[PDB]
Structures are given as C-alpha cells and as structure tokens.
C-alpha cells in the first residue's frame, strides 16, 4: 500500500515504516497516482481526500493496462476535520441508496 498526503504527514508515515508520498494539489497527486500505477507493485493507494476530490475521474485518467490499485480517498486539511465531514457524507449516502434527500 502507498499513502499520498501533504508533505509533513507523508514524512510521518515514512518514519512509521509506511510508504508515504507527499503532494500539495489534486493534479500533483494524480501524477503521483499515474507514476505509482505504471511503476506497478501497489494493491491500494490511500489518498488524503483534500488531494483526491474526484477519484472516479482519477481512475478515468490513469488509463494504462491493466489491473488497478484500489483508490481510497481518506479525510483532510487542517480545518477540514474540525468540521465533521460525516454528517453530510451520511446525508448523501442515504439519499444515494433509497433515493430521498432525507431531512436530517
């Protein structure tokens, strides 16, 4: 697995023994996906969501082969946690399913 995060965090994943790679934009990060994809050995890439706001378009672009890394947007930036990016992820996921923008 690789992790793509802001450079300070990426550094911290490395010190923990994990394979963190640093990026500071949606585009930069997509570049990183493509180098990893071509380079070949990863089964999963966990990406800070601030760096992957459109992960379907992300797959779309990587185009190459061929068998893909699962692509996993995970929380971000600093002020983006000190929300709750959950309450609304949940509003969308239930509408998503049943069809009904329910009054939460």
């Amino acid at each position: 697995m690789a992790v793509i995060a802001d450079p300070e965090t990426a550094q911290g994943f490395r010190l923990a023994g994990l394979e963190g790679y640093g990026a500071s934009s949606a585009e930069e990060a997509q570049s990183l996906l493509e180098t990893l994809v071509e380079r070949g050995g990863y089964a999963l890439v966990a990406v800070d969501e601030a760096l992957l706001p459109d992960p379907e378009r992300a797959v779309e672009r990587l185009m190459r082969g061929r068998d893909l890394p699962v692509l996993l947007p995970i929380a971000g930036l600093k002020e983006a946690f000190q929300g709750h990016d959950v309450e609304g992820y949940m509003r969308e996921l239930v509408r998503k399913t049943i069809g009904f923008d329910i009054k939460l």
Binding site: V94, R95, T97, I98, G99, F100, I102, K103, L104
Partner: protein, 143 residues
C-alpha cells in the same frame, strides 16, 4: 352527501375526511419507499406522518363490531373522533416544526386515551382536544 353532514352534523365534515384521506394516501406512498430503502433515513416529519397515519387506521378506520359501544358509531361521535385525530396531527406537525422530538410525542399520555376513544359512549371524547393541546404545551414547556 357532504351538505347533509355540514348542515346537520359538522361544518367541516368534507374537509376533515379529505385531510384524513390525504394522510392515508401519503402513508401508502411512504410505506412503498420504506419497503425499498428502509425506515432509518426517515426524517422526523415523515415519522410523524406515519405516527398519525397509524392512529387514523387504529383509532378511526378500525371498528369493533363485537363491542357493545363501538358496534355502532353515531354521526356526532364520528366527527368528534375525527377532530381529535386531526387536531393531534396539526399539533404533532407544529411541535416537530419547533424541534420537539417525535419520540416525545409518540409517548404522549393523551395518545392512549385517543386509542380507546371508540369505546367511550360520551362526549368526554371532544374533551380530548383540550387535553391534547395542554399536553403539547407541557411539551412546549420542557422544549
């Protein structure tokens, strides 16, 4: 037949039955959707409509042919029970709009009395309207 009811029983007979039927109509639509996406996503507003829709079915539509009282329901009693249910509806929707928990309304003490109203042979039934309003006030008090 609406004019016979309006002139002899109650001025709001037609409006009341149209309102109850719209309630039942809405419940039917809601239950169809719930059959698909489950009931967990339901907003408080939709849970209230099912709550009152259920009271209409159990407290009004259902009648006990075997009970000495509910075997026959006089015209005067039919409208009075309708207004207790419709008044509970308005109060229910009004309380929700003011952030009253539906769970708080669902266990409102008057509800059990509304459920046994079909068994009362005295107008003690229209008294339930005032009993409903004050009880909601006790829910407007606690907030």
């Amino acid at each position: 037949l609406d004019p016979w009811y309006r002139e002899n029983v109650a001025e709001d007979y037609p409006e009341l039955r149209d309102a109850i039927s719209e309630l039942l109509q809405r419940e039917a639509g809601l239950q169809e959707i719930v059959q698909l996406v489950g009931p967990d996503a339901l907003q408080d507003a939709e849970r209230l409509v099912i709550e009152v829709g259920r009271i209409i079915r159990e407290d009004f539509l259902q009648q006990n042919a075997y009970h000495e009282v509910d075997a026959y329901c006089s015209m005067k009693k039919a409208y009075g029970i309708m207004k207790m249910i419709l008044a509970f509806y308005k109060e229910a929707e009004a309380a929700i709009k003011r952030g009253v928990s539906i769970d708080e309304i669902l266990q409102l003490p008057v509800l059990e009395r509304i459920g046994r109203a079909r068994y009362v042979s005295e107008e003690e039934f229209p008294a339930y309207f005032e009993e409903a309003m004050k009880e909601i006030q006790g829910a407007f008090k606690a907030l």
